[PDB]
Structure formats: C-alpha cells, structure tokens
Design a protein around this nucleic acid. Structure first.
Ligand SMILES: [Mn+2]
Ligand SMILES: [Mn+2]
Length: 546
DNA sequence: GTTGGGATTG
DNA sequence: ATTCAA
DNA sequence: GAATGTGTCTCAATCCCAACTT
C-alpha cells in the first residue's frame, strides 16, 4: 500500500548482494564476483529493470509488459544489460514459449493458413501445432510484422545460486523483504554471528543445486534409470545435505511402488535413512513376494527401532511374515480398551463438519469446548520454550527471515540447547510457568514460529487451558514432542473440553461415519491412557427422521 | 458483459 | 484424509 | 488389513486474458 521510495525492490536486492559479499566471500567464483561488480557499474534504471525481471515468473518478457514509471523507458534501460550478455534480444524460441508470449488472437492470425479445424482452447492448438513446427526460430522467423521486441534473461541460474546462498534454501523469494516491511510476515529477530552462514563449503551449494535439479527433472517425467546414475551412490559428509538426498531417494521409491516395480523400490528404500523408510522396504519385499528377506529385515528392525512409529507397524508386519514362512502364530493382548463414547446426532444440514457438530453438542453451560487438534499443546510448548528455540546457537540463524532454527529437525537439537531446555521446562516445577507464558504470549504475538498457532490461541482458550491443565501432564507432553519432533506433532485429538469450575479437562477425538483412528493418533492415545490422562474417542452416527 | 485463474504489486 | 478386500 | 488422491512453506487488492453468456 505504497512504501515511500519507489525503488524499494532494488534497494533490497543491493542489500542481498553486499551480504553475500561479506559472508560468502571465501565461497565465490570468478563468474560470481564478476556479476556483483558488473551490477554495481550499471546505472540505476538498468539495475532496477534487471531486478524486475529477476523477480517475475517468466524468463521471457515482451517489452510492453515491462512498464514501470521509476524506470521510465524500457529500451533505454535494457541496453547496458544487452551489452553485458545478461539479456538477449532475438532469443531462439520453442513453439511452446512463443505461445507463452503472444495472445490467442495474434496466434490464430499468424497460423491462419495451417489451421482451419475450429477455434478451440489455446493449449489444444499448441498440441495440434507442435507436430508441424518442430524447430525453434528467432521471433522474426515466426512473424516479422510483430511490433514488440522480446527479451530473455540469461543469468537466472547465477541469481538462483545467490538466493540459495542467502536463504539457505530455494523456496523463499525476494518478496520476503517487502512482505516483512509491510508487517505481513513478522519474524523474530535474533542476534546471530557476524559470519554466520547457511553453507560452509562451496561444493555443498554445488550439491544442493544438483539435488534440486534431480527433483525437478523427476517431476517432469524423466525415467529413473538415468536419474539414479546422476545421483551419488555414496552418502554426503554434510548432515543436513544428506537429509535432502535421502528424502529424494525415498520419493523415487514411492513412485516405484505405484508402478508396481517392487524390487527396485526395496533397493531404493534400503539405501535411505529417512524416517519410516526401512518399514516401507519390508513392506515392499512382502509385496514383491519375498518373505524370507522381508522377515529377515523385520527381525533386524525390531532389535533397535528407529522410532515409535516403526514399532507400531512392525507389530503388524512381523506376525504376517511369520505366518507366510510357516512359523507358528504367537500370543498377544488386544489393543488396550479404546475409551469409547457414542453419539447419535441430528443430520446437520447443510454440513457443518462433524467436529463442529460434536463441539456444539458437548458445549453446555458450565463447559467450554474448543476445536484445536494439537494446536493447543504445540502452542503452549512453543511459548514456554521460545528462548530455547530462538537461542542464537552457532549456525542456527543467518538472515532476518527465519521462522525456525535451521537445526530443528536435527537429532542433536535437544543436546545443543539442553542448558536452556532444562531452564525452560524447569519453570513447570515452580509456579512461574503460568506468568512466563502469559508474558511470552503478549510480547511474541504474531511472530512466525514453528510451534505457536496464534489464530487458534485466543485469550479465553489460553486462560482456561492455563488454569485447567496440570503441569505434570505438560511435562509429560513437552518431553514426548521434544523426543521426535516431526513424528510427534501430529496425532492429538480434535477437541478439548474444559470444566473451568473444577479445573479439569478431557480431550476428545471425533471420528465420523466410516472414519477410523490413524496411526499417530493411536500412539497418542496409548501414551495418554498410560499416564491416566483424560482422553476419549467419540464415534458419531447420524439420525435422519424417516 | 461476466467468471475464474494466474501473475504481479507493495 | 479418503477408498478396496472379506 | 492394505492401498492412493499431496510438496508445508496459509498476505489481499489488481490487472490481464482466456473461457464462457445471448
Ligand atoms: Mn481431525
Ligand atoms: Mn478426527
């Protein structure tokens, strides 16, 4: 809604350039330093223009779309950049690309002679015409009576490299700068180090691009046979960067299981240390009619499971596999009594989701019901332990746009902060946790964070939950979430009802018609009935009056 | 003349 | 977070 | 009991441009 200087975007970009200049100094190229120096030389209007095309979706641009008052004359402004080889008039265009720049009418005009079928949707015209014109051409070789030049940015790879270096990733755009200055995103500010950085070695960055490239080509239909050749068969020394590879292999293997080539899926899964990969491997060997290997792997697994989620699903596999090897089946006890509560209910209608239905039914005078589904517990954990999460641990923050420390899913995350996590959870054992949370709720409100859900967490909910939830149950929860952060933020029950009168609560997971407990949920209920925490599963039928 | 999607803006 | 198999 | 529709990257106006309506 108007920031005072019309050149705000280029100012932001010059910031990024200088930042890379002083932090990633020792990591740079001849190409890269050449680019930064060259960009400094350029006049203001041409710098600005370059930035406008960098920030925009395409790589090609009709001169008409490049209309800006701060820049003024597009053609006068683009000359320095054409000279530099960073922009390209008369680029050579594939026919899809040409369909991207021109309008439908212009193209019905231009191909009037090779088309008479019918005026139909534009994409279908492209389908009809790519057979005919297989070769690319300059723009004048398509039509030379077209009155508008067209420019191709040819330095987008170097810019992507820079954006990667700044953010440590490739999903955050440059608008992070303007969105945060309008107060739309609002991040927490951390004093990190004067030489904190996302990437220590250059070959790391080289590898993040390589992996990213592999994910992209995969999403456009390329066969694994050459993708797999292109990946490293040997792990990476960087921990976080091996994380990204191992995930990639995982998805390759999911694709593999869809096509029902099970043996390659077993292979790929087995060379991955991803969460719950080993379990997909056993399941694929089973699906591949390979029971001795699968049994073998499952017995290897139940020695030291990666996770609770792995135990839970081993308890299903291992019998099934013993069966399929002709080994006698084995005794067990049943799933501990699901604390079941039924409700016949009026047919909405119109809907009116189930959880709102129950939320209203159980909401009586004297009893407050909230729909939260683990927003409330992750929230109270985020608030208590804020200054732990946002502690300035070396390498963990390195620009002003972090919603979360970069080592949050790291397995040494607890360790590195154990000092401040015992300090913060310790506030539960005194009386001070109530107040500390109400202060942190007031100060940190609206701050992008990984754990707090400010929209959901009103003042009524925070007060009631504060005075109704015992601290021993909270210690029990925050310890569990800390244990396996990405696996245990997941399955907590839909509703929480409080009786503020008696400072007591009960969480209720609502299951509608033909809905059953998912695995994370079942793990959470087990954990709860082991601390004698009030949970209950509510199964809902409907009732139509015939 | 109107609707809906995707890009662009600050 | 929804669908087949018996 | 299993499968298979998501990827976390949750900002609102505004403009352009296909597509539909008689
Ligand atoms: Mn739910
Ligand atoms: Mn539910």
């Amino acid at each position: 809604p108007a920031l005072p200087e019309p050149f705000y975007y280029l100012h932001n970009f010059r910031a990024v350039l200088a930042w890379i200049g002083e932090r990633y100094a020792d990591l740079l190229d001849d190409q890269e330093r050449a680019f930064i120096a060259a960009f400094a030389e350029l006049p203001e209007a041409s710098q600005a223009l370059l930035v406008r095309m960098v920030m925009r979706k395409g790589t090609l641009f009709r001169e008409g779309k490049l209309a800006y008052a701060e820049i003024g004359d597009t053609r006068a402004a683009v000359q320095p950049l054409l000279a530099l080889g960073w922009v390209d008039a008369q680029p050579t265009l594939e026919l899809a690309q040409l369909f991207g720049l021109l309008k439908k009418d212009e193209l019905s005009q231009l191909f009037r002679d090779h088309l008479g079928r019918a005026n139909l949707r534009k994409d279908a015209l492209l389908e009809r015409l790519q057979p005919l014109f297989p070769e690319a051409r300059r723009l004048a070789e398509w039509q030379a009576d077209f009155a508008e030049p067209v420019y191709e940015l040819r330095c987008m790879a170097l810019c992507d490299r820079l954006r990667l270096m700044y953010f440590g990733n490739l999903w955050q755009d440059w608008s992070e700068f303007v969105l945060a200055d309008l107060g739309i995103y609002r991040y927490e500010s951390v004093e990190f180090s004067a030489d904190s950085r996302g990437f220590r070695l250059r070959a790391d960055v080289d590898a993040y691009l390589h992996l990213f490239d592999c994910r992209q080509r995969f999403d456009l239909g390329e066969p694994l046979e050459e993708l797999l050749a292109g990946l490293p068969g040997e792990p990476y020394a960087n921990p976080w960067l091996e994380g990204r590879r191992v995930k990639l292999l995982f998805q390759f293997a999911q694709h593999c299981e869809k096509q029902r080539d099970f043996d390659l899926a077993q292979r790929l899964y087995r060379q991955s240390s991803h969460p719950g990969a080993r379990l997909r491997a056993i399941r694929s060997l089973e699906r591949g009619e390979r029971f001795a290997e699968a049994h073998a792997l499952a017995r290897e697994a139940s020695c030291a499971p990666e996770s609770d989620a792995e135990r839970q699903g081993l308890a299903r596999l291992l019998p099934r596999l013993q069966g399929k090897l002709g080994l006698p089946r084995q005794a067990r006890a049943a799933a501990p009594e699901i604390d079941r509560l039924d409700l016949c209910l009026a047919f909405p209608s119109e809907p009116c989701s189930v959880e709102w239905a129950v939320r209203e039914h159980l909401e009586e005078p004297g009893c407050a019901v909230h729909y939260v589904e683990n927003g409330l517990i992750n929230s109270l954990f985020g608030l208590l332990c804020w200054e732990a999460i946002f502690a300035a641990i070396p390498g963990a923050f390195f620009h002003p746009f972090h919603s979360a420390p970069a080592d949050l899913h790291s397995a040494d995350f607890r360790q590195r902060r154990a000092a401040l996590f015992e300090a913060c959870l310790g506030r539960l054992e005194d009386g001070s946790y109530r107040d500390a949370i109400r202060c942190r709720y007031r100060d940190k409100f609206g701050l992008q964070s990984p754990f707090v859900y400010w929209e959901l967490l009103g003042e009524e909910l925070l007060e009631q939950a504060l005075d109704c939830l015992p601290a021993a149950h909270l210690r029990a929860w925050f310890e569990r979430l800390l244990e396996d952060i990405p696996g245990n933020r997941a399955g907590l029950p839909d509703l929480i009802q409080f009786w503020p009168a008696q400072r007591r609560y009960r969480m209720v997971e609502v299951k509608g018609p033909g809905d059953r407990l998912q695995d994370n949920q079942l793990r959470w209920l087990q954990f709860c009935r082991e601390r004698e925490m009030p949970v209950a599963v509510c199964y809902v039928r409907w009732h139509v009056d015939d």
